[PDB]
Design a protein around this ligand. Structure first.
Ligand SMILES: *[C@@H]1O[C@H](CO)[C@@H](O[C@@H]2O[C@H](CO)[C@@H](O)[C@H](O)[C@H]2NC(C)=O)[C@H](O)[C@H]1NC(C)=O
Ligand SMILES: *[C@@H]1O[C@H](CO)[C@@H](O[C@@H]2O[C@H](CO)[C@@H](O)[C@H](O)[C@H]2NC(C)=O)[C@H](O)[C@H]1NC(C)=O
Ligand SMILES: *[C@@H]1O[C@H](CO)[C@@H](O[C@@H]2O[C@H](CO)[C@@H](O)[C@H](O)[C@H]2NC(C)=O)[C@H](O)[C@H]1NC(C)=O
Ligand SMILES: *[C@@H]1O[C@H](CO)[C@@H](O[C@@H]2O[C@H](CO)[C@@H](O)[C@H](O)[C@H]2NC(C)=O)[C@H](O)[C@H]1NC(C)=O
Ligand SMILES: *[C@@H]1O[C@H](CO)[C@@H](O[C@@H]2O[C@H](CO)[C@@H](O)[C@H](O)[C@H]2NC(C)=O)[C@H](O)[C@H]1NC(C)=O
Ligand SMILES: *[C@@H]1O[C@H](CO)[C@@H](O)[C@H](O)[C@H]1NC(C)=O
Ligand SMILES: *[C@@H]1O[C@H](CO)[C@@H](O)[C@H](O)[C@H]1NC(C)=O
Ligand SMILES: *[C@@H]1O[C@H](CO)[C@@H](O)[C@H](O)[C@H]1NC(C)=O
Ligand SMILES: *[C@@H]1O[C@H](CO)[C@@H](O)[C@H](O)[C@H]1NC(C)=O
Ligand SMILES: *[C@@H]1O[C@H](CO)[C@@H](O)[C@H](O)[C@H]1NC(C)=O
Lengths: 136, 417, 194, 97
């Protein structure tokens, strides 16, 4: 058996012609990039969500050739938070909960809030104000 | 002409309505699907305009639509109501529908059953072809918190929290309100409170067994998941089509042919793959419209069945609607409709009016019934025979006009005193 | 059919749908609302109509004192229904339109079998005979992709019209529940008036 | 400020509402529609792959949906109630319906 194909008839494994050593072919690391912006009127600050990857494994490219976005400055930055949607770089996670402003996913939202330089923060969205009805 | 069937008993019936509210949010990397690792194919695809951008825009609209659907169905209430620590509620047992603190998810037993029922790997193979799944904005725990808040509001405040501030009411009095809503007097409930509570508890217990026993009970949800997965698989399989080219592999076409011949073959492959993507996106839009209609129905049922008592027939279950309970399910909602069903009907002789003196008397709120020798006035949905008096009847005209009028005495309460 | 487009029979025969309508209407006459919400409870029809008068805010004595007049009005209106259906060509147009759409769409599909789609001919055998097999295959695949596009367009439009028909049928089922199995207080949901 | 209109009479009005519940159920053959009698075209058709699997699946879904629509509209009641032999009904005439 010289090689193997996946469902889409794409080669996913191959036998080396010289060494006859079996090799799996996995496509190079790829993913979606989402830019959370408060609005260019409000600010030029942004946050970057790398979707469906742990940011142990976010682009750590040190040369422009190694990875397609040539903007490395928003990778492995000071503000790094892991979500189930992806890992978000450039927004500080706060334990406070607010009404959703910019949806990120898995219950995490982002907002541009003052805290006193105003910056992008990430938080768990607030479902509402808790109440207890005085049942008797 | 003169026979009426009056129910002498009732059944508290709990039924389940299962409604999809959201579908899987999918994203397609258009370049990675049309041109996996061929940069030449990517440069050629740049010449096809805004096809990929339009597909991305449509899929993003679908995903935002799914989040909006879930928000409309479950985020109706802005207060996260909590059930009281003492769960008595007049003998009505809500443990199967109330959140269970022992479970880490804070999910009810029925909801836990619902979540259990709905279900290289296919995910990895699809991802390697540019097809990925975006997580929903609201977690399953957040949707469970919405359902728990809705249940707590319904149990502690009736329908008041739906129309404004939550107003505490004892649950037996709320269910008496609901019997008034279905046309049955409060005394029927207060006199039969233990029986009604036991019937409700037994029906709620049978709900879990009915959901467990039938594999296809939640099929309406599962089908939605299936309808997504198959579609994605179809897309992946459409990457094996040559579309009239020498090969389905872009790299083989480029390696084997000079630029003029390769262009004719890569054009065929790119056109076929773009057609496959357009077909997928169009069918996703149609399915998203169907899911939006389903979620709009679910939101309407949340408003009119859970946040109130509906007089619409069969909108909130089979029978006379009393109240409803929401339960979160994977990509959907299950409404437990508690309804009142008349039972143990009995035949009686009936007359449109009673002729007393020269006056015709009509029942103010009920029916004139006869067991064979004596005439009573009873409420329509329950047999509670009462003596015909001037209090429970009103007078209109002479006896001649009414067809079917029967002679009988109308007792005057004040005359003895 | 000879071009590959066939029509499948509906699962319910028109006789079975007639039996459903007969059962629903007999239940409405004999039992009023009761069969909709549970066991069918016998009610004399004048008393059911008096209930329905109470539902709209009118007392029972109004119906009982005017029973003959109300019955005559109902009989006259039902008599006028058949004439009104006869007179207006568009009275059932909403039905006919649906049929027309289906019937028209199929013809379009059939007509798309007479389109060259840029090739020399719309007949496959003529293209194969009049061209070299490598040259002929290009035109044949052009015809094939054109016919696949026609089929996909037909299926997409059928999906959209099926969504519209599903919305209409959901509305019809809601009207069966709320207008036939009950008395509705929703304004204009079950006709003009109370 | 002080004037009301009170009805002194009534009309029993019967109106019609027409609602389509189902459409014609159609099935399509790619093999015959695309390639009427050409086995050569039939063999060429497999190159395009799963288009007709998808099309047949969609049409079958529509066809099942039509029967589901008819069930939803007309099969609401599971008891086939039978009208009484004697059709008096208090002077109301239902012979037309
Ligand atoms: C109304 O129906 C209920 C059942 O839903 C009757 O209660 C049952 O009565 C039988 C015999 O009397 C007992 O064996 C059951 O244990 C009872 N069940 C419950 C839940 O109470 C009730 O008696 C009926 N009422 C009338 C007036 O007929
Ligand atoms: C409410 O109902 C639940 C079950 O639906 C009751 O829990 C059961 O209690 C019995 C006896 O106490 C046990 O034998 C079962 O094993 C329990 N089942 C579960 C799932 O807990 C509960 O006791 C009821 N609450 C009240 C106040 O009666
Ligand atoms: C119809 O109902 C009346 C009233 O309940 C019955 O008359 C009563 O019968 C009981 C005996 O079963 C006596 O103790 C009461 O004094 C009677 N009341 C009156 C006002 O006479 C009557 O027997 C019932 N008839 C039938 C056929 O059930
Ligand atoms: C209410 O309207 C009905 C007609 O819809 C009236 O009935 C008419 O009465 C007149 C005089 O009694 C007769 O000449 C007509 O033949 C009747 N028409 C029908 C269709 O029966 C009825 O009189 C009106 N009532 C009031 C109080 O005005
Ligand atoms: C119910 O209405 C039908 C018509 O819809 C009546 O049948 C008509 O009766 C008259 C006189 O007997 C005839 O001139 C017509 O030709 C009949 N038409 C039809 C279609 O049968 C029927 O008599 C009415 N029922 C009652 C009890 O009056
Ligand atoms: C983070 O990524 C690492 C690297 O593969 C993985 O081992 C780990 O499970 C990830 N953590 C989470 C919470 O996903
Ligand atoms: C009473 O019912 C019988 C049979 O249902 C019917 O023949 C008779 O006409 C009815 N009474 C009157 C006054 O019409
Ligand atoms: C009422 O009487 C009819 C005829 O006598 C009978 O068929 C029916 O079963 C009776 N219903 C009840 C509830 O007794
Ligand atoms: C009882 O009804 C009959 C039927 O018309 C009537 O003749 C009689 O006068 C009535 N009895 C009264 C009014 O005491
Ligand atoms: C009565 O109506 C007139 C004109 O419509 C208005 O000016 C007047 O204020 C009304 N009556 C009262 C008490 O306001």
């Amino acid at each position: 058996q010289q090689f193997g194909r996946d469902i889409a008839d794409t080669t996913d494994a191959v036998r080396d012609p010289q060494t006859l050593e079996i090799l799996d072919i996995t496509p190079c690391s790829f993913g979606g990039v989402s830019v959370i912006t408060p609005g260019t009127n409000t600010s030029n600050q942004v946050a970057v969500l790398y979707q469906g990857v742990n940011c142990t494994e976010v682009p750590v490219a040190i040369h422009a050739d190694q990875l397609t976005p040539t903007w490395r400055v928003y990778s492995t930055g000071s503000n790094v938070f892991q979500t189930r949607a992806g890992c978000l770089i450039g927004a500080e996670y706060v334990n406070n909960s607010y009404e959703c402003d910019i949806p990120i996913g898995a219950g995490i939202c982002a907002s541009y809030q003052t805290q006193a330089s105003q910056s992008i923060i990430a938080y768990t969205m607030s479902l509402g104000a808790e109440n207890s009805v005085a049942y008797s | 002409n003169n026979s009426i069937a009056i129910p002498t008993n009732f059944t508290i019936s709990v039924t389940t309505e299962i409604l999809p509210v959201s579908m899987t949010k999918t994203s397609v990397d258009c370049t990675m699907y049309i041109c996996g690792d061929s940069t030449e194919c990517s440069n050629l695809l740049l010449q096809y305009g805004s096809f990929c951008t339009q597909l991305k825009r449509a899929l993003t609209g679908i995903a935002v639509e799914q989040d909006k659907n879930t928000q409309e169905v479950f985020a109706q209430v802005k207060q996260i109501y909590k059930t009281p620590p003492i769960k008595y509620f007049g003998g009505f047992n809500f443990s199967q529908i109330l959140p269970d603190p022992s479970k880490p998810s804070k999910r009810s037993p029925i909801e836990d059953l619902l979540f259990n029922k709905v279900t290289r790997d296919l995910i990895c193979a699809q991802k390697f072809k540019g097809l990925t799944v975006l997580p929903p904005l609201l977690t399953d725990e957040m949707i469970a918190q919405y359902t728990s808040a809705l249940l707590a509001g319904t149990i502690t405040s009736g329908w008041t929290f739906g129309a404004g501030p939550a107003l505490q009411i004892p649950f037996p009095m709320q269910m008496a309100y609901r019997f008034n809503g279905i046309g049955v007097t409060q005394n029927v409930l207060y006199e039969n409170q233990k029986l009604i509570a036991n019937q409700f508890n037994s029906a709620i217990g049978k709900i879990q067994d009915s959901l467990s026993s039938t594999p296809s009970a939640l099929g309406k949800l599962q089908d939605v998941v299936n309808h997504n997965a198959q579609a994605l698989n179809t897309l992946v399989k459409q990457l094996s089509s040559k579309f009239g080219a020498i090969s389905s592999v872009l790299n083989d076409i480029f390696s084997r042919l000079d630029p003029p011949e390769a262009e004719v073959q890569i054009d065929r492959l790119i056109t076929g793959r773009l057609q496959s993507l357009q077909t997928y996106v169009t069918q996703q839009l149609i399915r998203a419209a169907e899911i939006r209609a389903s979620a709009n129905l679910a939101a309407t049922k949340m408003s009119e069945c859970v946040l109130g008592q509906s007089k619409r027939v069969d909108f909130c279950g089979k029978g006379y609607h009393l109240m409803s309970f929401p339960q979160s399910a994977p990509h959907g909602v299950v409404f437990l409709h508690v309804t009142y069903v008349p039972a143990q009907e009995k035949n009686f002789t009936t007359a449109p009016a009673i002729c007393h003196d020269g006056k015709a008397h009509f029942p103010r709120e009920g029916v004139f019934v006869s067991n064979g020798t004596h005439w009573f006035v009873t409420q329509r949905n329950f047999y509670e025979p009462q003596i015909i008096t001037t209090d429970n009847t009103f007078v209109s005209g002479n006896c001649d006009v009414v067809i079917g009028i029967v002679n009988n005495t109308v007792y005057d309460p004040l005359q003895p005193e």
